């Protein structure tokens, strides 16, 4: 597996007209999937990470925006990175996006981290674009290879014992971090339970306790669930993604939770920026922002 050749070809299109594809070989992509899967399985399902690092939310195949985020924040390994999931679906270049992220995981496995989003799941990405992209540009066998890799992604991270990171949010079944560590891999995303909620739940300003989630799965949770969670586990901040936010980032529960969304111009309704959160050595948080077009 010639990782530097793969990374070089993926980065070659910087400065091209947004849209230019990078077409790796099928054998190269299979190799990225197989090697990264091995690495994911060798590292904990609940990652224990150190600052400083940059944290990114949903990308959804917006490859040229991923390149902008790296341009702004430093290409790996100049900065350490944690991505919160939702790499594929919706956008035009899910393949380039996930291939670059997997290549960086293999090259910098202790300095580059990828969590699982709810779109890293065959049931969802079958319908939301990634299956179609794989079928068009490669074949369905490669989509299964991607799925096998996604089934091994870690689910949450704690930065310096203070920032709890996951794609979606909290779970009514999450009482101990050991419950997360006990999750076996490979696994699909279930339609209910702890793993489901970590990838699917949402905070809500108008919910007291746990509420029904408009997505048809998992729950919403209120500001006091957040406060109680941080107190119980001696944490300072929940960092999650999963929801489009106009500013690219949005605080909740008196700045006890932050939502990051890194794909600008995601929706037709409102314009949205994409934001990446810089966490300095003392856990102070700032933002680098792709403003909407």
Residues of this chain that interact with Cl ion (CB under 5 A) are 208, 222, 224-225
Please list the residues that pair with 181 across neighbouring strands. Answer: none
| Nearest Cα to Cα of residue 29 among 109, 133, 127, 184 | 133
Give the separation between CA 191 and CA 194, rounded to whole angstroms: 10
Residues tagged active-site: 119
User: Of the listed pieces 113-121, 141-149, 172-180, 278-286, which binds Mn ion according to CB under 5 A?
Assistant: 113-121
Report whether 265 contacts 18 (CB < 8 A): no
| Residue closer to Cl ion (CB basis): 176 or 208 | 208
| Measured CA distances, 206 to 51, 116, 240 (Å) | 33, 27, 19
The CA-CA-CA angle for residues 133, 135, 137, to 5°, reads: 65
Smallest separation, CB 57 to other proteins (Å) = 13
Residue number, 90 or 240, with CB nearest to other proteins:
90
Annotated binding-site residue numbers for Mn(2+): 58, 60, 86, 118, 167, 242
- What is the smallest separation between the CB atom of 149 and Mn ion, expressed in angstroms? 18
86 binds, among other proteins, Mn ion, Cl ion, none (CB under 5 to 8 A by kind): Mn ion
**Nearest alpha carbon to residue 244 among 260, 257, 258:** 260
CB-CB contact of 259 with 203 (8 Å) = yes
214 lies in the site for other proteins, by CB under 8 A: yes
Count of residues touching Mn ion (by CB under 5 A): 5
- Is 215 a binding residue for other proteins by CB under 8 A? The answer is yes
Name the minimum Å distance from CB 202 to other proteins. Answer: 9
Question: How many C-beta neighbours within 10 Å does residue 4 have?
Answer: 9
If one asks whether residue 212 binds other proteins (CB under 8 A), the answer comes out as no
For position 262 contacting Mn ion by CB under 5 A, the verdict is no
Residues 115-144 that bind other proteins (CB under 8 A): 124, 127-128
Q: Whose structure tokens read 């997505």?
A: 215
How crowded is residue 2: how many other Cβ atoms within 10 Å of its Cβ? Answer: 10
| Residue 237, phi-psi category: left (phi > 0), alpha (psi -120 to 50), beta (remainder) | beta
Binding mask 44-83 for Mn ion (x = CB under 5 A): --------------x-------------------------
Is 216 near other proteins (CB under 8 A)? Answer: yes
- Sites of contact with other proteins (CB under 8 A): 90, 124, 127-128, 214-216, 243-244, 266-269
């Amino acid at each position: 597996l010639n990782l530097d050749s793969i990374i070089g070809r993926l980065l070659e299109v910087q400065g091209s007209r947004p849209g230019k594809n990078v077409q790796l070989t099928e054998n190269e992509i299979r190799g990225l999937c197989l090697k990264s899967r091995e690495i994911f399985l060798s590292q904990p399902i609940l990652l224990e990470l150190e600052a400083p690092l940059k944290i990114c939310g949903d990308i959804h195949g917006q490859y040229y925006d991923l390149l902008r985020l790296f341009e702004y924040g430093g290409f790996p390994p100049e900065s350490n990175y944690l991505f919160l999931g939702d790499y594929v679906d919706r956008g035009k270049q899910s393949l380039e996006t996930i291939c670059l992220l997997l290549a960086y995981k293999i090259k910098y496995p202790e300095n580059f981290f990828l969590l699982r989003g709810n779109h890293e799941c065959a049931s969802i990405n079958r319908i939301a674009g990634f299956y179609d992209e794989c079928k068009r540009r490669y074949n369905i066998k490669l989509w299964k290879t991607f799925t096998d890799c996604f089934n091994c992604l870690p689910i949450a991270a704690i930065v310096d014992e203070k920032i709890f990171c996951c794609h979606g949010g909290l779970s009514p079944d999450l009482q101990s971090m050991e419950q997360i560590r006990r999750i076996m891999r490979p696994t699909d995303v279930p339609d209910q339970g702890l793993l489901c909620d970590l990838l699917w739940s949402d905070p809500d300003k108008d919910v007291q306790g746990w509420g029904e989630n408009d997505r048809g799965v998992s729950f919403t949770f209120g500001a006091e669930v957040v406060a109680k969670f941080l107190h119980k586990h001696d944490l300072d901040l929940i960092c999650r993604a999963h929801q489009v936010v106009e500013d690219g980032y949005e605080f909740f529960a008196k700045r006890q939770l932050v939502t990051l969304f890194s794909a600008p111009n995601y929706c037709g309704e409102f314009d949205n920026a994409g934001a990446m959160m810089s966490v300095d050595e003392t856990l102070m948080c700032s933002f680098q922002i792709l403003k909407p077009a």
